[PDB]
Amino acid sequence: MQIFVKTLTGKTITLEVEPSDTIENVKAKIQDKEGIPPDQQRLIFAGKQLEDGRTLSDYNIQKESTLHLVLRLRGG
């Protein structure tokens, strides 16, 4: 199923995922598409940050839902 990920620059990332995919899996797919390392990725849905070990179905994320990508780690 197709979901959308909105970024700082207005460019939307379009992903093909399964409801059982974990947030960590989603971050891996974003790395493949965009080059962004998963450690720098923060995923926002329903106002809250999603944790890497839970699945999209856990957060009620369905077809054509939109996630928000906030880019920052770099924690020296």
Partner 1 sequence: MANIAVQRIKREFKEVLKSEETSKNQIKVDLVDENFTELRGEIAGPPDTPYEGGRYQLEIKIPETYPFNPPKVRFITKIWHPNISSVTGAIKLDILADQWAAAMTLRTVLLSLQALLAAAEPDDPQDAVVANQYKQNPEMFKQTARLWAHVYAGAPVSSPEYTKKIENLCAMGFDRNAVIVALSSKSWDVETATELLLSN
Q: Between 10 and 75, whose beta carbon lies closer to partner 1?
A: 75
Within the chain, how many helices (H) and strands (E) appear? Answer: 1, 5
Q: Which residues bind partner 1 (CB under 8 A)?
A: 74-76
- Look up residue 45 and give its two tokens: 């849905």
Residue 40 beta carbon to partner 1: minimum distance, rounded to whole angstroms: 12
Q: Between 18 and 39, whose beta carbon lies closer to partner 1?
A: 39
SS3 content of the chain, % helix, strand, coil (to 5): 25, 30, 45
Q: Between 53 and 75, whose beta carbon lies closer to partner 1?
A: 75
